[PDB]
Design a protein around this nucleic acid. Structure first.
Lengths: 320, 53
RNA sequence: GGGCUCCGGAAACCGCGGCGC
RNA sequence: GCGCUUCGCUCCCGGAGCCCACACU
RNA sequence: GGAGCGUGCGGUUU
């Protein structure tokens, strides 16, 4: 099970010995509860039933939030991973959108067929697909894995490139296999950096923990409920920038080469990037105007056009 | 909804047990929710209990 | 002149049109 | 008949606000 | 206020 985001990079060092003053900053770790929310995203496990937005709907009301949004629109009946980003962190969703997505499926064939043929055929897809629904853009299926076959039911997992519709993938197999098939049940196992781990939590848990916080004044639980926006870019290639630069990119400065402290391998021209402090907080998002190596060897020009900034201003002192 | 989990060892399956690790399976597609949420305080009390709140 | 942040119908109830039981 | 027909996001445009910033000698 | 992810338009009124 390998998607495009599970390849490990190297941490490339530009300023071999640099330091950050704690006095101006809030690391993801110890932010005051009330602002951890302003800058959080919940790894939600969407129940079946509600449309994906109508969930976010209730998340707002019930937590007296104003403005929150969700990741890849998961349909009414699908359950599973639905990152919902809160308050000021709302737009981190941008980051999520064009990342991997893994599903567990349950296709149901409209007629019998030899177990191995099902396997043979589905394995046929591992690669590029041209989308053919019932009677034009290509989409990758990073891998299919068949768990179990019972009669005409075929429970599998599958990983896909942003905006594959699993219904179709199935309908397609359906035709491929000869008999025709329909998708019976679906569930999203991961959107990009949001996995089905210990951080994925259910509406109910979320609310109950939040009440433990208001009625009962326990912070713990309702904190471990929300994830700090940093985890919404974990999948993106990051560049760590030195303190002075932080203040700048905040105000609308495109980040220039001699701001870089640490870097990630294999960046290219026009790739999304996460600008980070040495405290490992999200500063902003941009397109690299300069490859990985290019950024490390040089001191002339600009690394990344800055295009969206999350980090607030007063957080770092101006100084430039 | 037929898909089931056995979340401890994290394996989906339509069966009742994951023999590989002998954990019974629960249904995959997580408990439905209505903003009404009756049983709200009723469950809350059950939780407060296993934590000591 | 460019970059960034914020806002730009944020209102319930009513008639088709459009998908679903 | 009952439910949904959009939380919100992105590009442009209009308005308000902040900067003009290679991140020190 | 437009375009798109996503099927939209005409009436009592923040």
């Amino acid at each position: 099970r390998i998607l495009p985001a599970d390849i490990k990079r190297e941490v490339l060092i530009k300023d071999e010995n640099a330091e950050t003053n704690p006095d101006w900053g809030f690391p993801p770790e110890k932010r005051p509860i009330e602002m951890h929310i302003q800058f959080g995203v919940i790894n939600l496990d969407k129940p079946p039933g509600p449309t994906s937005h109508e969930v976010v709907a209730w998340i707002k009301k019930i937590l007296n939030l104003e403005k929150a949004g969700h990741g890849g629109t998961l349909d009414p009946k699908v359950s599973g991973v639905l990152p919902v980003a809160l308050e000021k962190a709302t737009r981190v969703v941008q980051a999520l959108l064009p990342a991997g997505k893994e599903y567990v499926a349950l296709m149901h064939l409209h007629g019998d067929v030899p177990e191995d043929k099902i396997i043979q055929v589905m394995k046929e897809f591992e690669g590029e697909i041209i989308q053919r629904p019932p009677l034009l853009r290509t989409r990758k299926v990073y891998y299919i894995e068949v768990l179990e076959i019972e009669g005409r039911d075929v429970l599998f997992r599958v990983g896909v490139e942003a905006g594959t519709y699993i219904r179709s993938l199935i309908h397609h197999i359906g035709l491929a296999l000869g008999v025709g098939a329909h998708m019976s049940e679906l569930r999203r196992t991961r959107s990009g950096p949001f996995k089905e781990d210990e951080t994925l939590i259910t509406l109910h848990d979320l609310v109950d923990y939040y009440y433990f916080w208001k009625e009962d004044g326990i912070e713990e639980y309702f904190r471990k409920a929300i994830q700090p926006m940093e985890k919404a870019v974990e999948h993106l290639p990051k560049v760590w920038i030195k303190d002075s630069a932080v203040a700048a990119v905040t105000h609308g400065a495109d980040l220039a080469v001699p701001g870089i402290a640490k870097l990630h391998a294999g960046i290219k021209r026009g790739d999304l990037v996460a600008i980070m402090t040495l405290k490992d907080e999200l500063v902003a998002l941009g397109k690299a105007m300069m490859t990985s190596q290019e950024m490390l060897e040089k001191t002339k020009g600009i690394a990344v056009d800055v295009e969206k900034v999350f980090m607030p201003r007063d957080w770092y002192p101006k100084l430039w | 909804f037929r898909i089931r989990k056995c979340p401890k060892c994290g394996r989906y399956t339509l069966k009742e047990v994951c023999p590989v690790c002998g954990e019974k399976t629960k249904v995959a597609h997580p408990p439905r929710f209505s903003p009404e949420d009756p049983y709200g305080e009723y469950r809350r009390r059950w939780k407060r209990e296993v934590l000591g709140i």
